[PDB]
């Protein structure tokens, strides 16, 4: 009785404390910088041969290799410069919703509705990409996975749980709880000491790998959260949601900086990413178009059209030379 | 122009392209079926009839037609987020048990399973991702239903049913109420078959329902329909 009422008072106290800190609107401060202007990006490469609904891609750190996840049961690793296919990984379970590429380039992760995360070794002496390690113990569908290191990986699952996995050991070291809704995506900061995961309870919670407990929590969205990506500095993270809005949250400020939205678009945001500088915010909508927005100006800098179906995922490479978008029409297109 | 290793890399990519097109043709012939229903409906029984954590995938071949049955009952997650994965499906196999009306829900709240099953069927049928997908309805435990309806009337659970106590009348009334839950009758057929202890009958009905879907798809492809 008293304890439940206290929670409402504590939340109200946090609300008042947040508003106490805020003095100047970010849009008023960003007015000084001039607008970037029209940004036109032309298609450079068209990748074919998936023949099924693509859900996930991930860039390598060499800025040339990228993995792609399709519903036919194939992980295809691409040579982006020469259009050649480097690897074709047959999958046991066709239903796959995420794929990760290691920073060293040794390993490839995948996961989906089978509740199993499969780690594939690429530098084996036999020459065939075989199953190295299968992670198990998730009660919900895996939605996202990212390699912190060649031995450690954080996966997000549909049982409202996240976990830090030791690849060599095969068991989970740190388990995260406290998500009311189902988690949908996660992103890694460059220092890799912390990550933020957005769930279906309209909240995005920062997670500290070393501490193992929730550092911060933000609830600025209306309904759910489909996507979340860190800024290059590591202090901000743009979020994409199903309410046709995009919001930017600052860890140090601990409040909603800015809201990115326009009246005509009512469809959701599948994926978000950042460029090398971080000036351009790219987000793939369900209108068959990818909109390149500007973070500071909060205005549309460009429109990427050319996909025949919903854009499942979007990823900007490490050096920032190219942007490869994945859609449900089984075509991967590289935008420069 | 290209170096010696680069020309060999293109040759490796062409070999992969041959395998992906070969695997793509194999998957196109295969018929994908989505299995839905409650846990106590009898999903495990009817899969064992057709044969003889996460996704349970069933492979059986009847009359040179490949069937994939995907059982999603194990997952506890919210169904709304991952339901769009099954957009390209031929038919939905929805299984419920006729004897569920006397057995109240496991949760403390008083609710008749039959009405929970109506809510289960209504969300799938009126789902925006499933507009042209036919539903293959299976009614389980008819033999137990025949005994129970002799011992207990159907009036007690809801007063709306005022028909005489008969096995044929009670079964047909449950069948037509499930058909009335459909809101788009012209573009979505509902195939209702009473399950039984005879294995042979169940396998056949699925082949007849899938064949009409393949006819419907081909007619749409031609442009006649």
């Amino acid at each position: 009785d008293q304890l439940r009422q206290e929670a409402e008072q504590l939340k109200n106290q946090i609300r008042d404390a947040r508003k106490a800190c805020a003095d100047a609107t970010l849009s008023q401060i960003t007015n000084n910088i001039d607008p970037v202007g029209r940004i036109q990006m032309r298609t450079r490469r068209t990748l074919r041969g998936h023949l099924a609904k693509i859900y996930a891609m991930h860039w390598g750190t060499d800025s040339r290799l990228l993995v792609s996840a399709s519903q036919d049961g194939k992980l295809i690793i691409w040579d982006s410069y020469t259009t050649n296919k480097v690897h074709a990984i047959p999958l046991r379970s066709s239903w796959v919703m995420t794929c990760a590429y290691a920073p060293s380039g040794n390993y490839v992760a995948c996961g989906g509705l089978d509740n199993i995360c499969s780690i594939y070794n690429l530098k084996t002496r036999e020459g065939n990409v075989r199953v190295s390690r299968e992670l198990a113990g998730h009660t919900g569908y895996l939605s996202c996975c990212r390699f912190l290191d060649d031995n450690q990986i954080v996966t997000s699952s549909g049982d409202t749980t996240c976990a830090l996995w030791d690849i060599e050991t095969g068991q989970q070291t740190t388990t995260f709880t406290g998500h009311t809704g189902d988690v949908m995506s996660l992103s890694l900061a460059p220092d890799t000491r912390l990550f933020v995961s957005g769930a279906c309870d309209a909240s995005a919670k920062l997670w500290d790998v070393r501490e193992g407990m929730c550092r911060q929590t933000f609830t600025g969205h209306e309904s759910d959260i489909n996507a979340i990506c860190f800024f290059p500095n590591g202090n901000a993270f743009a979020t994409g949601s199903d309410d046709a809005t995009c919001r930017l949250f600052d860890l140090r400020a601990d409040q909603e900086l800015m809201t990115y939205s326009h009246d005509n678009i009512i469809c959701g945001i599948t994926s978000v990413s950042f460029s090398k500088s971080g000036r351009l915010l790219l987000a793939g909508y369900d209108d068959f178009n990818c909109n390149v927005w500007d973070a500071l100006k909060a205005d549309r800098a460009g429109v990427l059209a050319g996909h025949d179906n919903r854009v499942s995922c979007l990823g900007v490479t490490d050096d920032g030379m190219a942007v490869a978008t994945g859609s449900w029409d089984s075509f991967l297109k590289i935008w420069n | 122009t290209l170096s010696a290793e680069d020309k060999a890399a293109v040759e490796r990519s062409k070999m992969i392209d041959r395998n992906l097109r070969e695997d793509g043709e194999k998957a196109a012939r295969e018929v994908k079926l989505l299995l839905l229903g409650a846990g106590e409906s009898g999903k495990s029984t009817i899969v064992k009839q057709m044969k003889i954590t996460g996704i349970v995938e069933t492979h059986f071949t009847f009359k040179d037609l490949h069937f994939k049955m995907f059982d999603v009952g194990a997952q506890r997650s919210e169904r709304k987020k991952w339901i769009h994965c099954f957009e390209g499906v031929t038919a939905i196999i929805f299984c419920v048990a006729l004897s569920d009306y006397d057995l109240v829900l496991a949760e403390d709240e008083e609710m008749n399973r039959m009405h929970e099953s109506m809510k289960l069927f209504d969300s799938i049928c009126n789902n925006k991702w499933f507009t042209d997908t036919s539903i293959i309805l299976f009614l389980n435990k008819k033999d137990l239903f025949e005994e129970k309806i002799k011992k207990s009337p159907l009036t007690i659970c809801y007063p709306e049913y005022a028909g005489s106590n008969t096995y044929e009348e009670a079964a047909a009334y449950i069948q037509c109420q499930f058909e009335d839950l459909n809101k788009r009758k012209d573009t979505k057929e509902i195939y209702t078959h009473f399950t039984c202890s005879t294995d042979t009958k169940n396998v056949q009905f699925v082949f007849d329902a899938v064949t009409d879907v393949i006819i419907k798809n081909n007619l749409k492809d031609c442009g006649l329909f």
């Epitope: 040339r64 040579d79 480097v86 036999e126 020459g127 065939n128 | 170096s3 680069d6 040759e11 490796r12």
Partner: single-chain antibody, 231 residues
Amino acid sequence: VQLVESGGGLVQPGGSRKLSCSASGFAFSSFGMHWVRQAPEKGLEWVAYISSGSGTIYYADTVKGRFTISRDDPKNTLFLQMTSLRSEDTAMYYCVRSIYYYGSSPFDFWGQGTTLTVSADIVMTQATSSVPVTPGESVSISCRSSKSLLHSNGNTYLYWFLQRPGQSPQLLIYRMSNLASGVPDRFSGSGSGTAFTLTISRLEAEDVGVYYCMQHLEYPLTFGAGTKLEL
């Protein structure tokens, strides 16, 4: 991963002999196969190549026509067909597996070698022939080419091999910018077009052998003379 050759022995000149190499512990159908021959008192020499799936076949110009190469993937056996052998074919024949993609390390695994004794173009130039060295000092080995190996894609197709006495040769450095898997960090390659340099810091007794520089810019593959070190 293991490759063993069979079919050796003495062959009369003008006869015929069919070698068979059996593969174990790897996917034989995905690797291209190289035949390398070695004279008793001379360096290595390339013979032939077959691609995976038998899509393309290349030969050296001196061995064109007489030698026929085939492969059978369901039995995992590499077949070499030899017709009208001559007195210059008295060599030991090696089997080599080479996979080709971005980041791959071809020429990594070498066979054991079958002896065959018969009784009656980018020229790679080893400037030196033998250098006496002591264990501990840095050792410099130079190789030169007749054509600039710097291709327009940025890769320089020079591979460094070490053939330890009485053992099969192993790959040390591939493309000169990458160290092979299983090679210590004692070896380093440097240089530019037409002028290459190899350095061995913290020399070891096992390192002692014959060093080969190989071009892989265009067929036919031509090898180096072979710089031998001693103590």
